[PDB]
Specification:
Elements lengths: L4 E5 L9 H4 L2 H5 L4 H22 L2 H4 L34 H20 L3 H5 L3 H15 L3 H14 L3 E7 L3 H10 L11 E3 L5 H12 L4 E6 L2 H9 L4 E3 L3 H13 L3
Parallel strand pairs: 1-2, 1-4, 2-3, 4-5
Helix pairs in contact: 3-7, 3-9, 8-12, 10-11
The structure holds beryllium trifluoride ion and magnesium ion.
Subunit structure: Interacts with DACH2 and SIX1, and probably with SIX2, SIX4 and SIX5. Interacts with CAPN8. Interacts with GNAZ and GNAI2; this precludes interaction with SIX1.
Subcellular location: Cytoplasm; Nucleus
Family: Belongs to the HAD-like hydrolase superfamily. EYA family.
């Protein structure tokens, strides 16, 4: 008999600042050095795709455009993938191939779960140190943006009748890499991440409502138009985020309500 809320977050320029570092709009809006903005943006970009290629089978899975990690779970036999050799299995077919596809997404899921709170372990040294230094420069230049978004994400997580869902235009694998490198692994259960690169956010929202029911209250949080328009088409309240203040306002609302 408890009211339940489903928070449908956007990632880029909502929870994290990354793309706006390359375009110079963030540095320009808050008076930061544009040259530092771009340097940091490119370094993080390198780390995101390097983690993607090296550990999340990005060169293998990219051309699939999958929406959710479990979309091809039908073809998984559930075997142990601890010693399974992905390189020598000839993936690059339509049935024995579907099984190898599924194996890869589940191994991604396993990597994500064992390393979500130990990204330094996954990334390995010396990348870990460079990563911690990058995150440090990033937090400074963005005036603790991530610190603010996390405060809302963690209040949502700790609250019993609230849940965190993620919908991003970023492709699925790179999205998981971003989420991991920005320390969001522990706040977003992998089964709650959706990539709207191709089906679009409206479809993803519809799918998320099918999954959580009509009795739950949805709140679409984001900085972009797509997300807002999709929220209208489904009569889902929309919470826009344009600056730190907006993340603080969400946090405030989150702490005054007991469900
Ligand atoms: F992550 Be959202 F698509 F900017
Ligand atoms: Mg966005």
């Amino acid at each position: 008999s408890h009211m339940e809320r489903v928070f449908v977050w956007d990632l880029d320029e909502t929870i994290i600042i990354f793309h706006s570092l390359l375009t110079g709009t963030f540095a320009s809006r808050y008076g930061k050095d544009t040259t530092t903005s771009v340097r940091i943006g490119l370094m993080m970009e390198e780390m995101i795709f390097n983690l993607a290629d090296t550990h999340l089978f990005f060169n293998d899975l990219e051309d699939c455009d999958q929406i959710h990690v479990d979309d091809v779970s039908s073809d998984d036999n559930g075997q142990d993938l601890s010693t399974y050799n992905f390189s020598a299995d000839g993936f690059h077919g339509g049935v024995d191939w579907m099984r190898k596809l599924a194996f890869r997404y589940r191994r991604v899921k396993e990597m994500y779960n064992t390393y979500k709170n130990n990204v330094g372990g996954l990334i390995g040294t010396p990348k870990r140190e460079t990563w911690l230094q990058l995150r440090a420069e990033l937090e400074a230049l963005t005036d603790l943006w991530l610190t603010h978004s996390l405060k809302a994400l963690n209040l949502i997580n700790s609250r019993p009748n609230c849940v965190n869902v993620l919908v991003t235009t970023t492709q699925l694998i790179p999205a998981l890499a971003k989420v991991l490198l920005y320390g969001l692994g522990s706040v977003f259960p992998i089964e709650n991440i959706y990539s709207a690169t191709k089906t679009g956010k409206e479809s993803c929202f519809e799918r998320i409502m099918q999954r959580f029911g009509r009795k739950a209250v949805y709140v679409v949080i984001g900085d972009g138009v797509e997300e807002e328009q999709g929220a209208k088409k489904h009569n889902m309240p929309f919470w826009r985020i344009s600056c730190h203040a907006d993340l603080e306002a969400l946090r405030h609302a989150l702490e005054l309500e007991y469900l």
